[PDB]
Amino acid sequence: NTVSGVNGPLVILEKVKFPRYNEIVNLTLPDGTVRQGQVLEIRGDRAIVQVFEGTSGIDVKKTTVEFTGESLRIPVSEDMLGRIFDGSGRPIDNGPKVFAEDYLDINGSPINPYARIYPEEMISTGVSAIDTMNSIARGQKIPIFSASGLPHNEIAAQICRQAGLVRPTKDVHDGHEENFSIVFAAMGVNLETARFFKQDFEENGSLERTSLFLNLANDPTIERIITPRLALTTAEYLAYQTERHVLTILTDMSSYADALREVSAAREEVPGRRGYPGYMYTDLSTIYERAGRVEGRNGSITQIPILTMPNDDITHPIPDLTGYITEGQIFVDRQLHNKGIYPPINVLPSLSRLMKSAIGEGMTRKDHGDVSNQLYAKYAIGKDAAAMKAVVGEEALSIEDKLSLEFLEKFEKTFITQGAYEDRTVFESLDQAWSLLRIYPKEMLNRISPKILDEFY
Amino acid sequence: NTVSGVNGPLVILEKVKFPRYNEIVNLTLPDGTVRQGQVLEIRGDRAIVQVFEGTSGIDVKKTTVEFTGESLRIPVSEDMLGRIFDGSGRPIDNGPKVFAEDYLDINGSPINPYARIYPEEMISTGVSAIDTMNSIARGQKIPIFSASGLPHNEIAAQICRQAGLVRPTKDVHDGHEENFSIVFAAMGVNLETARFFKQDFEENGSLERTSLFLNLANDPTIERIITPRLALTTAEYLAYQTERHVLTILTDMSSYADALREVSAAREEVPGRRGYPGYMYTDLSTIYERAGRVEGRNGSITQIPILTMPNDDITHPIPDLTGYITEGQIFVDRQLHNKGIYPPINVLPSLSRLMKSAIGEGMTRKDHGDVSNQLYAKYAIGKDAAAMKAVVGEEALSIEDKLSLEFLEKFEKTFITQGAYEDRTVFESLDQAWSLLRIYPKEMLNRISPKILDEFY
Amino acid sequence: NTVSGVNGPLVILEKVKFPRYNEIVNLTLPDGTVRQGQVLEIRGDRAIVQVFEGTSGIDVKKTTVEFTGESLRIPVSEDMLGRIFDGSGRPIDNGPKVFAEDYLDINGSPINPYARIYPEEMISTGVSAIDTMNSIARGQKIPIFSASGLPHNEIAAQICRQAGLVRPTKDVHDGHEENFSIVFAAMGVNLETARFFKQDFEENGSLERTSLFLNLANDPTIERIITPRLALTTAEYLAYQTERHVLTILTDMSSYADALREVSAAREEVPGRRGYPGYMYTDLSTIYERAGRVEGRNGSITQIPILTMPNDDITHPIPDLTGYITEGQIFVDRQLHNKGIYPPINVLPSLSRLMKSAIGEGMTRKDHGDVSNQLYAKYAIGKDAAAMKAVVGEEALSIEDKLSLEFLEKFEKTFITQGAYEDRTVFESLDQAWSLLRIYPKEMLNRISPKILDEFY
Amino acid sequence: YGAIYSVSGPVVIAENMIGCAMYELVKVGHDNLVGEVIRIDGDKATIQVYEETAGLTVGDPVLRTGKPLSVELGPGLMETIYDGIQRPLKAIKEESQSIYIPRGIDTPALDRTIKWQFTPGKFQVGDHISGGDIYGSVFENSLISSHKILLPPRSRGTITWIAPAGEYTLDEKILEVEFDGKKSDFTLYHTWPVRVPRPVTEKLSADYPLLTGQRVLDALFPCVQGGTTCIPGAFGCGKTVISQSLSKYSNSDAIIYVGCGERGNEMAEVLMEFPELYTEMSGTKEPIMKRTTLVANTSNMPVAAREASIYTGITLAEYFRDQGKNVSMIADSSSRWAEALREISGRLGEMPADQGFPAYLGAKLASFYERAGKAVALGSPDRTGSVSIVAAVSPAGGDFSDPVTTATLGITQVFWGLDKKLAQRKHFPSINTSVSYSKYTNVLNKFYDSNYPEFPVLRDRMKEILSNAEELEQVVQLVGKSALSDSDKITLDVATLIKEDFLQQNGYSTYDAFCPIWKTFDMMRAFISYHDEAQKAVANGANWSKLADSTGDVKHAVSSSKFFEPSRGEKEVHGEFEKLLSTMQERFAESTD
Amino acid sequence: AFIILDEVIKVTNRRVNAIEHVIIPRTENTIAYINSELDELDREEFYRLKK
């Protein structure tokens, strides 16, 4: 029909009642430009659409509507790596075209087949603090919690690039037997960021390794929400049909959450805690549910979402929600970054509750998990002692505390300090970790089972 | 009188003008069960009812309604006592109707003479910590402020138990010369705790003297608020017609308060501060209305409400509005509880203003208000002396602060710490208080007349 | 036609579209009471009027309307000086009105000619503590930030009365030659407070030089928000047309902000933090647009608003936004009031943004900047010295602290403490500065050029 | 005429109402209940109903009375306890057997059956009269005739007939005015609408005090009649005690006691206290109660009444001000009144923008308060009247930076503090110097200088001690002191004394809270003198411990001098204090050497 | 005196550290977190009344 009105990202159509929910419609501007949207609400003889593309210039009887008569599905192909796409279901970059062999829905249940069997295969990042203290699995979800003084993009790229070199070393070990694929999606970040990422992937290896979805900040909030959904379709097909392990790097996850926030402000929808939607739980879930092993059980989708915290607080709604849902927490610290530690990952609150699922034992040691717990415990004591060193001085602290202050310093500067291309095998990391444990005496290492301490020291 | 719609438990009826405010309706369901409901609002060509038994079975054209023709009134008996009753009455709790002697309006429309007559003589609760510090007088409302993380239930139980054990000690004192009756109205309390209340009355042998109305937290919200209103009407019958001293315990005011919030989310009336009604105060005041001394001095109703602070602050709505109406407050203590004390209240936030003028003589002394004041002063300082020790050390502490520290402990574990079957005379309380208070010279004590302090030092 | 209804001070009249925006309409009641209103909003087939006169006792069927045909404008003359008016410009001097030479728009002003040549020349108030530490330039917006533990109003009479008597003392320095007028607006004033200002200006011989507008805390809000608007216009007519410096004193800004909160929800709009409008700013800015030097470059509208916070609350929107537009603020101390130093203003948290460029010449010295530095730094060390003394003793106090200890009491008792009719320009302030400073040696006075110092120590 | 469309709470909607005013008294229902149409939106009138609802049906007739809600001002107001629109409680108590007026039952504001003694004025047949003039008097009160029968404000004309002395009723006619034909018959009582303020000839300067009798009040800043005063409360800081004590000391000719939405036991208490308690000068017969008119509302009464309570009280205060009587308006607590506006805001279906309190709150809180003050009496005979409002204020948002407290501090001129934590240690009122201010100080202190006290000097010094003491106390806590300068200990020590003698008072021990304004001057005089000797002694040499110990005997006596009140003579400056002064100097010498 | 000064300095060095490191960030975190929750209750109400 024709546009009735427009109030923000919501468009009021006066139409007829034949449309179905999320059925595509195309808005024909008087310029003769077509932009796409999907109906968010349908009522009798009228619709509310949210348009992906644009949010202004929308007329009345000079404008027209046309129905596509297909509710939105993403055209998925398995020849997607190396190929350049834009976050809009097609490239607007003029990159190699998407093609379709299935079109798969982004609602969060197309044909979805996931974990009835939990991850047991270890996948390494080449970084000790990640791998040893928390571990990463063939379905693991780990949030990178970052800040406005940390460089989020440099760490994001760091984890991805080094996990591509380690992952074939692990294929030979028989941790794997199937392909590796990267799906990189950037949604609504700066130009400066976008360019940087592509440059990073090229240096380490190639861009044949990865598939790229690029979405620009100048493009709307409505576009931004569809951008990860496009990533999900890509990854699920690859795992399902061609038994490939898929690694998704989703940047920026915070970018996506602010978008949700905008479609409740310029909607009449009342928001929940701290101005973030009440139905914010469901929006976030959609990304995280579509993870784990994929049917055949040689395919998988593994997630590393990248969150930048704006206030850097742990009372902000985004970091909290994400944490309950995700299988691990990786906290990256501004204070380490300042001191000259790269990567500057603080493990004080990094925790996995699904620690068993995260570790490996058939392509990693059984001792891996036992040592990690002890290390974490001994790091924590070393932090309690650090605060006490400032207050009390060395004028009353105990013999035991002194060992813990030394351990803390040796631990930051050796374990967490690694070259920009220097990759550590998980077995070598144990040897490093054992050096860290070795200064404490056999009565301070009392919590650990006697069997392990007498065996390996 | 057919249903237009149902939104929530609230039902929109079409009917034509007839019903008066709070006129009962009978809901005829097509399953062959009649359920009762109250008109909350009467309007032009519709009335809106909220149903007391469930909300199930409401249809549009398969339901019919017929009018009771009668505004809500309580069927009252004085043989109601010695028996278990319920808001609507159930046969499975042995009490399917009171078998009325009189129908009295629950709004005290026949007559309601209260609050132009001043409180009479002191009454024993058997707890030293209440009785000295706060004056509980017949024909007064003094509330118990309670808190979460603490069994508030246990405090209510101690009051029920000690009620009727005090009354022969008083009969000799000349504090009593008329019957004692307990009216227990339970609403929204846990099911397990309801059963503990029932056992306490039987054990003491005070089952005879009490009537129970029990409203669960699965019984509808409008029904829930009406149950305490029923029990107070019953108290007015006994107090005024047959000259009983009534002690009515109304637990738990938090469940009443919650109910207020959930209703009016579908009327024209629309909640106040933080989603709690602005007219929450009006509700409260209807409960406080039927309490007080009675004209011509036939009997009294005394009321001890139990409030649970849900956030553990008294700056929250439930303590805040209630506290302005009430003549003082007795607020519990979180800290004592952890230690293990029972009853665990504290005296610093507890004050009754009308203490000096209210009380009798011949089992409560003249020195009663004097000694309370002194006991609080030494305790304020003791609490603070702990705080200065934490930060700096023994640096701002002195001979005066060091005494006060000793005071805070001896008082906490001797005065406040008692049994839950211990009956303590107001004469006993004062004797013990003076013994404790010997810790400072007569010249350091000037919060008391020098006349009084020599007699009783 | 008739009045359709009333809801609050909002009057809904059923009329076509006949009044233009801001057109005064006369509601004619037949009971000897004529009332005037302004259409606040005009909508289709209805208009919303808020009445200047009353708020209740309006008929909804016996009222008739007449259109004045004149949108709100202020009759401005200059024989207004030496006369007391109310909040709508009607005289409370009694006797015939003054009328106009112009009707000028109050809404934002019909020509707005305000500064793009920043403030030069010094304005004195008559108090050394304000002048030297917190210098005010012609057309510079420096308010007095006050609190409720002080009589904010008294301190305000004092600045007004003593201002423009400074201008003759300046004529002798030959810094001024132009006629000074003063505009006074009292908003939400008590009768007793109101009379206090009138009687004070009358003593000084400043009453002839000022016009006073009183809006009482009992008159409509709409009338009260208009009160500063009328005052800003009088000041502007005198600045522009007759090339005069006019100082306008706007007390109390909280009354005006409160009034806006009452009209926020009167309106069909939604407020911001803590219930205070998010478009509070827009309103405040209207005041501020009239503020500054007028084009002609020897006339100005200088503005001192007084804002009272409840207990120095900076959680409140009002000091945080108002403080942004303005260029510094003058903070008053309760601690000095309590000691009995009056005026009790403290010059250390107080600021003048541009202070070396907020003075002129021939009516200041160039030594002004150097002394502001010296005065400030020694008063701060003295504040530290008081606290120090108490811990260390006097038997262990430092020799520099002793000079600082004395400095603290003399700066307060000479510079800050002064009479209710004392007057000060920058030269007078400056002589008193050197006598406080004289006590410090030259080698402790090093923020000052060696030139100045050898002449004035 | 009108028809009830809906009953929603205690608030009633009625259709078919037009040409009505916005304060019209309306009769709602078939029981003829009192109600008031605040607003009308089209044909629908929202009515605040000042009786209960438990059986109001739709389709019942609503009849407008054709006039505003007004109050009746005249004879027999004294010695009666009223609700918030005025109904005589006593008549109801025997007859209905109730205290909260039930539906089906109504009574008019004053009694009809009581005859009064009428005495003629100064005016005679032919004389022009206008508003606030004295047309006669009725002898009421203990000590003076308090009821001046005044012609209502804004009414004028000529009196054709002044009736002679005798006894007459107050529904009976005794005056006729001619102005546009016969204007009307007048009775003893005359009518005025409560939502409308009374006019006055003019406002006047406050310079006359009121004897509050509270030592701490009289000491720290002036006590003012014509006043505007706030005292913070919080419900559990001795606040009720100091209010009833205050009603008994007040030395004003009339006192109007206003229950906003109180405890209900207290509305019993003030009633019982008044006929059997003696005033400060001591009245003749039923001292306090004869002088008192009582508006008593508990929380349990209708919120429509609680809303009205404060208005009834101020119109009574204002009538009396115009009579040329000095009046005390004692109101407790405004926050409960504010809570009443809030109860109505949610029920009508308004938009609050002040933490669940109405947007309208600020204009109503202010408008009401401006009616108090000292003023020149309305009318030709010329008299002086005053209304001093002593108002308690309390939290209501739970904060202290909640709207209720923000609006009240701005409009008030006088604030004397109170702290809850110190109050618990028992030292109420436990005044906070920092939140306290007075604007009245200068004119009031000039007045007191004329009256004999050297007050102003002490006052600054009382404040100065308490201020430095405060600061010193944070420094003892924070650093955790290892020493003090010998002077600072004196400051702290002299402040402790101030706490006992003034701040620690109990309003039911009248030996421990009563002093006339001069007695107060002498006690403070003694303290300020002690500080003055003590500062000099350290300066001339002597240790603090030497200063404290050698001063000794006189230090005990001044501490213990708070247990006294005039009872050694009708004299306000005693030998008790004059003797101490010379002995104190004698003590000083000892300390020094 | 010298031995007495040495004993006192140690108590004094401990306090200067103690205030900065512990107290000041504990006050900051508590005030800001409560401020943020308190304003939220107030804002949502306005939105619900408006809706």
Curated annotation (Swiss-Prot), chains A, B, C:
Main location: membrane
Transmembrane segments: none
Protein's UniProt keywords contain Isomerase: no
Molecular function terms from GO: ATP binding; proton-transporting ATPase activity, rotational mechanism
Gene3D superfamilies found in the cross-reference section: 3.40.50.12240
Location of Phosphoserine modifications: S109
Location in the cell: Vacuole membrane
Membrane topology classification: Peripheral membrane protein
Cellular component terms per the entry's GO annotation: cytoplasm; cytoplasmic stress granule; fungal-type vacuole membrane; Golgi membrane; membrane raft; proton-transporting V-type ATPase complex; vacuolar proton-transporting V-type ATPase complex; vacuolar proton-transporting V-type ATPase, V1 domain
Binding site for ATP: R353
Keywords from the named record: ATP-binding, Hydrogen ion transport, Ion transport, Isopeptide bond, Membrane, Nucleotide-binding, Phosphoprotein, Transport, Ubl conjugation, Vacuole
GO biological process: ATP metabolic process; endosomal lumen acidification; Golgi lumen acidification; intracellular calcium ion homeostasis; pexophagy; proteasome storage granule assembly; proton transmembrane transport; transmembrane transport
CDD domains: ATP-synt_V_A-type_beta_C, ATP-synt_V_A-type_beta_N, V_A-ATPase_B
Cross-referenced PROSITE patterns: ATPASE_ALPHA_BETA
InterPro entries, sorted: ATP-synt_VA_C, ATPase_a/bsu_AS, ATPase_F1/V1/A1_a/bsu_N, ATPase_F1/V1/A1_a/bsu_nucl-bd, ATPase_V1-cplx_bsu, P-loop_NTPase, V-ATPase_su_B/beta
Its biological purpose: Non-catalytic subunit of the V1 complex of vacuolar(H+)-ATPase (V-ATPase), a multisubunit enzyme composed of a peripheral complex (V1) that hydrolyzes ATP and a membrane integral complex (V0) that translocates protons. V-ATPase is responsible for acidifying and maintaining the pH of intracellular compartments.
Assembly behavior: V-ATPase is a heteromultimeric enzyme composed of a peripheral catalytic V1 complex (components A to H) attached to an integral membrane V0 proton pore complex (components: a, c, c', c'', d, e, f and VOA1). Interacts with RAV1 and RAV2 components of the RAVE complex, which are essential for the stability and assembly of V-ATPase.
Family: Belongs to the ATPase alpha/beta chains family.
Any further remark recorded for this protein: Present with 131000 molecules/cell in log phase SD medium.
Protein name: V-type proton ATPase subunit B
Swiss-Prot record, chain E:
More details: Present with 8500 molecules/cell in log phase SD medium.
Assembly, per entry: V-ATPase is a heteromultimeric enzyme composed of a peripheral catalytic V1 complex (components A to H) attached to an integral membrane V0 proton pore complex (components: a, c, c', c'', d, e, f and VOA1). Interacts with RAV1 and RAV2 components of the RAVE complex, which are essential for the stability and assembly of V-ATPase.
Family, as annotated: Belongs to the V-ATPase D subunit family.
Protein name: V-type proton ATPase subunit D
Coiled coil: none
Source organism: Saccharomyces cerevisiae (strain ATCC 204508 / S288c) (Baker's yeast)
Localization terms from the record: Vacuole membrane
Domain of life of the source: Eukaryota
Residues of the full protein shown: 155 to 205 of 256
Function summary: Subunit of the V1 complex of vacuolar(H+)-ATPase (V-ATPase), a multisubunit enzyme composed of a peripheral complex (V1) that hydrolyzes ATP and a membrane integral complex (V0) that translocates protons. V-ATPase is responsible for acidifying and maintaining the pH of intracellular compartments.
